[PDB]
Ligand binder design. Sequence first.
Ligand SMILES: Nc1ncnc2c1ncn2[C@@H]1O[C@H](COP(=O)(O)O)[C@@H](O)[C@H]1O
Ligand SMILES: Nc1ncnc2c1ncn2[C@@H]1O[C@H](COP(=O)(O)O)[C@@H](O)[C@H]1O
Ligand SMILES: [Ca+2]
Ligand SMILES: [Ca+2]
Ligand SMILES: [Cl-]
Ligand SMILES: [Cl-]
Ligand SMILES: [Cl-]
Ligand SMILES: [Cl-]
Ligand SMILES: [Cl-]
Ligand SMILES: [Cl-]
Lengths: 332, 332
Amino acid sequence: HMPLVALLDGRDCTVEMPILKDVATVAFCDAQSTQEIHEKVLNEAVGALMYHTITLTREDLEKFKALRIIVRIGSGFDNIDIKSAGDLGIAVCNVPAASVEETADSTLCHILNLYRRATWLHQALREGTRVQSVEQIREVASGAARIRGETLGIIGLGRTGQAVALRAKAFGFNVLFYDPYLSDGVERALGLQRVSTLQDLLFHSDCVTLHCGLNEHNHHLINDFTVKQMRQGAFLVNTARGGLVDEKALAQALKEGRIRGAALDVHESEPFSFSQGPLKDAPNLICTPHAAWYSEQASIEMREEAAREIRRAITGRIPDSLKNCVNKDHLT
Amino acid sequence: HMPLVALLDGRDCTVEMPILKDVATVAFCDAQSTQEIHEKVLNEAVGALMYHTITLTREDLEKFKALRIIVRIGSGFDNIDIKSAGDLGIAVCNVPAASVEETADSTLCHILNLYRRATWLHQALREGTRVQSVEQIREVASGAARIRGETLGIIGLGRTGQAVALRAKAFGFNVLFYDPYLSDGVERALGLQRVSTLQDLLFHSDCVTLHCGLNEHNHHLINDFTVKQMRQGAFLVNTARGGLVDEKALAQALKEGRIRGAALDVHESEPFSFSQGPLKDAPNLICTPHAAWYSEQASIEMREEAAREIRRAITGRIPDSLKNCVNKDHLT
Ligand SMILES: Nc1ncnc2c1ncn2[C@@H]1O[C@H](COP(=O)(O)O)[C@@H](O)[C@H]1O
Ligand SMILES: Nc1ncnc2c1ncn2[C@@H]1O[C@H](COP(=O)(O)O)[C@@H](O)[C@H]1O
Ligand SMILES: [Ca+2]
Ligand SMILES: [Ca+2]
Ligand SMILES: [Cl-]
Ligand SMILES: [Cl-]
Ligand SMILES: [Cl-]
Ligand SMILES: [Cl-]
Ligand SMILES: [Cl-]
Ligand SMILES: [Cl-]
């Protein structure tokens, strides 16, 4: 028979089937954890596809007896211990290009929703507020600010971050970015301003947007300490990873007014709920259910790419034939 | 005594007082119609300031016995019969520059809210929807589309329209515009594509945004007939004037799905209410309470400019000293 490939945290395999039909047997688990995956998959699965709703620890990885390649249908892979996976001889890949501009457009929409209060204005109308006079327009829309001259601070000037910077300049934003891993001069190529420390970024930014990956060194990057370094009444946007922000510190900052508003597509604990979590009673909050990446074309694009990567690993040499393996250094 | 200047449809005069203290007596009416204005104002008012919530017909204008200048605190003046005002010897001015970029940023936010469904996703979370799996993310966010390659059609390429076009290009939009009054070649200067007829604009546009003024020739520009010329599942955005769209025709188009969604900051009858009007049961609708213009700096900027214009008219020669009079042709 063919090698077994399993969709860990999902059920739909329609897009991947035409690409893997003659290369592997495809099954799905629809499991939120390794405890929900049948022994057959853990015993015989040679490849694996997964999104962001299941975590793979070293303990989880050790339970796979034949897994040779994990392909994350998406850009982020913080939910996988790529180091231990490489130790166990498991290559890990991702799909980084499918949702770059989708996430940037969602970020700009979140930024504009804070500066223009469009979402809150709409919600006020749905709740029955009557805005007849100009005085009432100013009151209901109180907080909407002029964008030109404002400083947008970008943390992580990667593919998505660069797309955010290019769009932000079209609105008159003055864009700063902090990225301690980029080579010297990337700010000159894109006509941006760069700072060397996170504190400098937070000190000068009227609006801070996160576009870095979650790694072992930037967990709770926005914490009670760094939150005190942000400008009075600053904006916070996060379409990256919920693990980057201490919602406990963010919640208090919103209540006290030190942060005028926050737009979040990712949270420390998902799915997100307005009735649970540290943000239970936090005001001036816009939240989306981790959908900044999604478009019909982006969804199909990343699923087909991931399928081909699984194919290359089963019919080629690992990791030589892999196109987007993220743990070649750790791979044994 | 000094000449009397009256704030027709408002109450707050704090910003204008320091500019007019030694030039005119300032009073406010806070009236939605001429029927609520005291006889003293109609008899002695030499100047008048007004926003968009009161209409001035020829019948209304004839009731002023000493009015010599009307200054609209804003860009649009469709709520005034400038032709009859000029006939009666009444100069009419506006403030066109204060909210150009504010309105453009609100427009882009409305456009992004349609393509990214950020507002609807937020509202779904506030209503309690649980989005745990990727399949549920696609379902709840169903309709979010990739922006690059889409065609944004602009109706009216004025100051705001041009600002919208410049921003729209940063997202990968291919921008078309229809403006039968612009001189030949304005499309080359700004690197845009131009069409000659409204039908051509609607035929090619995936998203149609209105940025023209309401005049005697474009009332119900979007009607049951022209709505049938728009692409299947097109987007409609209106931060211009509610009188440009036939909400009856728009309502049915949304229900039948011929229009995938509409974002409206202006309506045929304001204040807008989700329980009254032709849009009572229309789906896929985003509405803001005529606040696309508002920012703290823009509000102060236009009020101070309008005050100086009233000053120039009282201490100078009409309409020679006026900076933004819009009816010099009709002025006797
Ligand atoms: N702690 C951090 N602070 C700022 N930027 C970071 C941090 N960690 C990673 N990055 C950057 O974030 C960017 C993300 O890349 P991309 O995968 O293209 O979105 C890269 O340029 C990284 O160097
Ligand atoms: N019916 C119409 N269709 C398209 N454009 C129009 C129409 N009426 C006026 N405009 C244009 O809309 C623009 C508005 O100018 P502005 O005052 O700068 O926003 C001007 O360029 C007008 O020529
Ligand atoms: Ca501020
Ligand atoms: Ca379409
Ligand atoms: Cl995902
Ligand atoms: Cl402001
Ligand atoms: Cl899909
Ligand atoms: Cl106004
Ligand atoms: Cl799409
Ligand atoms: Cl004001």
